[PDB]
Amino acid sequence: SLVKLANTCAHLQNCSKVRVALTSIPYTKLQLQFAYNLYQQGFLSSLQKGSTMGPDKDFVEVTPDNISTRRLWVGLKYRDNKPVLSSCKLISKPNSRIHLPMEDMKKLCSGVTIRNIKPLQPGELILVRAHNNIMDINEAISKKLDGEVLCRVK
Amino acid sequence: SGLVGIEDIEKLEDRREAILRILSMRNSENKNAIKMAVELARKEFERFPGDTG
Amino acid sequence: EKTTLLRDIRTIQDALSSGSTPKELLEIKQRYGIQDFSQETVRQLLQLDISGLEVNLEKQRSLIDRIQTRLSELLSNDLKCDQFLKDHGVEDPLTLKKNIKKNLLRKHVMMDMQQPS
Amino acid sequence: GHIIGKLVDVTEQPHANNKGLYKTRPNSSDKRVGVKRLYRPPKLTYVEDRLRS
Amino acid sequence: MLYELIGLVRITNSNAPKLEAKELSSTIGKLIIQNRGVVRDIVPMGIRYLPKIMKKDQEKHFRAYHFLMLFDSSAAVQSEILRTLKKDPRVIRSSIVKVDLDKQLDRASSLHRSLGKKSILELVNEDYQSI
Amino acid sequence: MSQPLLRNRSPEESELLKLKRNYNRSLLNFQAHKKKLNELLNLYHVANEFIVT
Amino acid sequence: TLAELLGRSRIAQVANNHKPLTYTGKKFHPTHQIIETKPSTLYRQEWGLKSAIPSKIKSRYLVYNDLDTLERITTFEPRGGTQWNRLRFQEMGVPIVSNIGRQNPFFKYISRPEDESHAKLSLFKEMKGDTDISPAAMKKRLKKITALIRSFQDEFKEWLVENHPDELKLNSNKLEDYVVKFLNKKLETKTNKKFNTEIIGTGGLSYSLPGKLKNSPNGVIQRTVVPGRILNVVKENNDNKWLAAIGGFVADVVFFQSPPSSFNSMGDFIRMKTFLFEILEASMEKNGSVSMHARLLEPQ
Structure with missing residues (x-):
């Protein structure tokens, strides 16, 4: 759900403003892939599965009995009195989805505004979804993949 | 544990008549009649015992 | 039929305590089908379905409680668990996963408390 | 020493409750996010306080 | 439905103060029991002075015999009883309030419930187990 | 990341779940049925004070 | 840990109290713990509380409810x-004695x-x-108990027939007697109001044991003489x-035969004079x- 992803992006911005160290997001495959990319790119300190009440200390198998109570817990980073994850916005919106070929993704990473999408800025992460997998735009260009430009994180 | 006799049957029949007048559907609110109808309708359409949704 | 249960049950309990056998009883032996008039026949004329439900509910609760205790204990003792599986016909249960084998245990505990009963 | 942030799953409540009913699904309280409890300063309690009173 | 009737009967004869009240209770009780109704209780409240001088059928009153009657009947019967009470010259004031039976089948009169006795069984069991 | 997001209920787990849920519904129906009979008994005890004749 | 230390701190030792600091009803015993500060700490407004007490306070004793409040005081x-x-x-x-001769x-x-022969009286x-319980929390003592007592039906349906x-x-x-005993016998093991909050004896007013005589240079003291004050000029209605004010306590004074004439003379100002009493x-x-x-010892 792109709506759920929009909710998460707005949630992370709200948490950054108040500087909470730990927050939770909905437990779904898309959310987990989104969070994992942020973690590997250095935007998130930690990524743990858990429940509505907090991160799990020991592994808890997820089943239909507890799926409704599952959450993903992410740790936010702050350095030099500045939040590392300041902004998080969707590019492809629920009411206007954007699919780009690899050629147009290369132009976006080269300073060209494609379909009103502002080009990639220094230190910014743009995520792309291809065949239900989320990857950095630079990785999609390396794999010659065409995909939906989901969001940009800075 | 026994060794006021028994009540006359006419008195026990009057106790039954009072209980059946107090519990008569024709003496109760219309909402009670509708509650019974909902149960009857549910059992004619249910897929299994306990199917209400 | 003006005859009422209370009155009829007051004749089967007075005729059974006085010895009188008016033809009404024979009729009552047809109104209800109760050919024999004993203290254990009025108790079976006045049986309420609720009583049966109360016993079915205890059996249902027993089964659930027994299945859970059995599997709970079996899992606590890996040795008794491995034996349990072999006794029920599992081949080399030792070489199995927790989920691949707990399902077997659950399927067996529920095959030893629901099939035998 | 009470643990904060732990949710008891329905799998951990196999036996019936004080009402005689089994728990088969999460309740409404279990489905509300409880992040606020992680940040609220815990209320410190002591058994000795009860004896002192 | 359970109903609670409170009627203020006229005391015409000072020698027989509780005469029209008895005659009236019999009339109302007969309507109830003859129309599939049940009379649960009849609590006399005694002669009381009216809060003011009241009027009815071109007559004035300064006192009345108060009585309560808890009865079970259908809505149609309850309206019939109220219509007869509003027309009887004996009755000065009459009110019929419904007593909810949603939670329990045996409710005592408001007078008794005000004193802590919620059911007629509590009143009867305090007249047998302790009297 | 490699762990499956959801593990479907085994057929056995679904059987035990159905037993508990059927029991929960049946127990509540029985308890309500018995409560109604206990109120009918307490109404019989007082029906001697009610007037129908 | 810090939590363990806090529980044993001197502030933790004072039991929580929110009773009105300004109470105008009848006072029978202390309601607040007196806090004392040494002269050296008083000079620095230090009382061992959260904040400094205002310097206007010259007493070395206080009673408090809250360490801090929304009013920042x-x-x-x-x-x-x-x-x-x-x-x-x-x-x-004067040792405190039981008028009922209890232990x-x-x-x-x-x-x-x-x-314990009044098992049905106290069970x-x-x-x-x-007396002062909620209309529904007290009603929760009817269903909650009924289930607990109803769980012992099988035990009492066999013991009584055996x-x-x-x-x-x-x-x-006699069955009712066996019932009262049964529950108590099965309740002594339970813990219903296992802690009793009633005052124990004197409550700490006096730990003196009766019996000892007071030696004095003028011989053993046989009657205790204490200065006091008569409050009313007319016996308690x-x-x-009458009523006297002796040593921070209000006592009932019995006179030998007659009331001294200073009563009528003084009138409503009788409290302005000090008399000698015997406790x-x-x-x-x-x-x-x-x-x-007490007893109004009058010069004779």
Whole structure:
């Protein structure tokens, strides 16, 4: 759900403003892939599965009995009195989805505004979804993949 | 544990008549009649015992 | 039929305590089908379905409680668990996963408390 | 020493409750996010306080 | 439905103060029991002075015999009883309030419930187990 | 990341779940049925004070 | 850890109290813990509380409710006067005695069931000692208990038919007795109000044991003479005794035969003069008050 992803992006911005160290997001495959990319790119300190009440200390198998109570817990980073994850916005919106070929993704990473999408800025992460997998735009260009430009994180 | 006799049957029949007048559907609110109808309708359409949704 | 249960049950309990056998009883032996008039026949004329439900509910609760205790204990003792599986016909249960084998245990505990009963 | 942030799953409540009913699904309280409890300063309690009173 | 009737009967004869009240209770009780109704209780409240001088059928009153009657009947019967009470010259004031039976089948009169006795069984069991 | 997001209920787990849920519904129906009979008994005890004749 | 230390801190030792610091009802015993500061700490407004007490306070004793409040002040009253009432009682050397001749609460006596013959009086006190209980929390004592007692039905349906079958077939006058005992026997193991909050004996007013004589240079003291004040110039209405103010306590004064003539003369200013009294006895009531009886010793 792109709506759920929009909710998460707005949630992370709200948490950054108040500087909470730990927050939770909905437990779904898309959310987990989104969070994992942020973690590997250095935007998130930690990524743990858990429940509505907090991160799990020991592994808890997820089943239909507890799926409704599952959450993903992410740790936010702050350095030099500045939040590392300041902004998080969707590019492809629920009411206007954007699919780009690899050629147009290369132009976006080269300073060209494609379909009103502002080009990639220094230190910014743009995520792309291809065949239900989320990857950095630079990785999609390396794999010659065409995909939906989901969001940009800075 | 026994060794006021028994009540006359006419008195026990009057106790039954009072209980059946107090519990008569024709003496109760219309909402009670509708509650019974909902149960009857549910059992004619249910897929299994306990199917209400 | 003006005859009422209370009155009829007051004749089967007075005729059974006085010895009188008016033809009404024979009729009552047809109104209800109760050919024999004993203290254990009025108790079976006045049986309420609720009583049966109360016993079915205890059996249902027993089964659930027994299945859970059995599997709970079996899992606590890996040795008794491995034996349990072999006794029920599992081949080399030792070489199995927790989920691949707990399902077997659950399927067996529920095959030893629901099939035998 | 009470643990904060732990949710008891329905799998951990196999036996019936004080009402005689089994728990088969999460309740409404279990489905509300409880992040606020992680940040609220815990209320410190002591058994000795009860004896002192 | 359970109903609670409170009627203020006229005391015409000072020698027989509780005469029209008895005659009236019999009339109302007969309507109830003859129309599939049940009379649960009849609590006399005694002669009381009216809060003011009241009027009815071109007559004035300064006192009345108060009585309560808890009865079970259908809505149609309850309206019939109220219509007869509003027309009887004996009755000065009459009110019929419904007593909810949603939670329990045996409710005592408001007078008794005000004193802590919620059911007629509590009143009867305090007249047998302790009297 | 490699762990499956959801593990479907085994057929056995679904059987035990159905037993508990059927029991929960049946127990509540029985308890309500018995409560109604206990109120009918307490109404019989007082029906001697009610007037129908 | 810090949590362990905090629990044992001197501030933790003071039991939580939100009772009104300004109470205008009847006072029978202390309600707040007196806090004392040394002269050196008083010079620096240090009382061991959260914040400095205002320098205006010159007393070394206070009583408080809250360390801090939404009004950014401490809720305290700079008074410690219940200690002087206790010390003045000690100076009168009158031991507190039981008017009912009960066992001394400060001694571990071997008691027996002599008073336990009222099992039905106190077992039901748990549900009947509800003078000031909520209309629905007290009603929760009816269903919650009914289920607990109803869970012992099988145990009492077998014990009664195995220990007293005759009563079950003859009369219930003795069956009711076996019921009261059964629940208590099955409740002594339970913990219903296992902690009793009632005042124990004197409540700490006096730990003096009766019996000792007071030696003096002029011989053994046989009658204790204490200065006091008569409050009213007319005996307590409906009572045959006046009221006196002796040592921070209000006592009932019994006169030899007549009332001194200074009463009529002084009138409503009788409290302005000091008389000598003899303290006959001192008793303790269940409310926690002290029933001091005195005698207006008049110069003769």
